[PDB]
Amino acid sequence: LNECVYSSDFGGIATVKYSASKSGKCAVHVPSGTATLKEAAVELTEQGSATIHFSTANIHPEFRLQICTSYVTCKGDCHPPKDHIVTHPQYHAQTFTAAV
Amino acid sequence: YEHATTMPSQAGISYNTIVNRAGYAPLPISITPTKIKLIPTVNLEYVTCHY
């Protein structure tokens, strides 16, 4: 997680370093309500890096990013947002855990 | 966003700071007082000279 802003919009950024078997395109998801992704699929070029946008509820996020017949355990610490009030509805599924 | 920081009242010397947050890049802030003035509230009582 190169950046995380716990916010209604997709304030969270994560880079996935990949070593693909062949370049192309394939999907990305999170099998959990912890994080909701902005994008559905990403393009890959042999071995390199790709960017995933997401919105989150957890202050101490941790989620399994499922990507292209695999999954990677993304984890990090996240910071509060800027504005008290925003002009759009929630994008990320609320969850009980917001602990230290 | 409200931020506050004491700035030493020296003339000619600069002062720098960075304001940052968990999801926002560092925003630099710089101050330089080139001349600090101390004007007192004054009124004239009289004027005197050689007689």
Provide the number of structural domains found in chain A.
1
A96 phi and psi, to 5 degrees?
Answer: -65, -40
CATH number, position A63: 2.60.40.350
Joined tokens for residue A65: 């990013």
Which residues 21-50 in chain B show a CB within 8 A of chain A? 21-24
Query: Are residues A11 and B1, on separate chains, in Cβ contact within 8 Å?
Result: no
The helix or strand, by DSSP H or E, that contains position A16, with its residue range, turns out to be strand A12-19
Place of tokens 């002062």: B15
After which residues does a break in chain B occur, C–N more than 2.5 Å?
none
Instruction: Give A5's DSSP letter.
Output: B
CA–CA separation, B33 vs B19, rounded Å?
A: 20
R_g (Cα) of chain B, nearest Å: 21
Residue A51 in domain = yes
Count the residues in chain A: 100
Residue A96 in domain = no
3-state secondary structure of A50: strand
CA–CA separation, A59 vs A100, rounded Å?
A: 8
Place of tokens 């230290």: A100
CA–CA separation, A62 vs B22, rounded Å?
A: 17
Q: Which domain holds residue A65?
A: 1-75
Residue type, B4: A
Provide the greatest CA pair distance for chain A: 45
Residue A85 in domain = no
Q: Are B13 and B35 in contact (CB under 8 A)?
A: no
Expt. technique: cryo-EM
Q: Which resolution in angstroms does this entry have?
A: 6.0
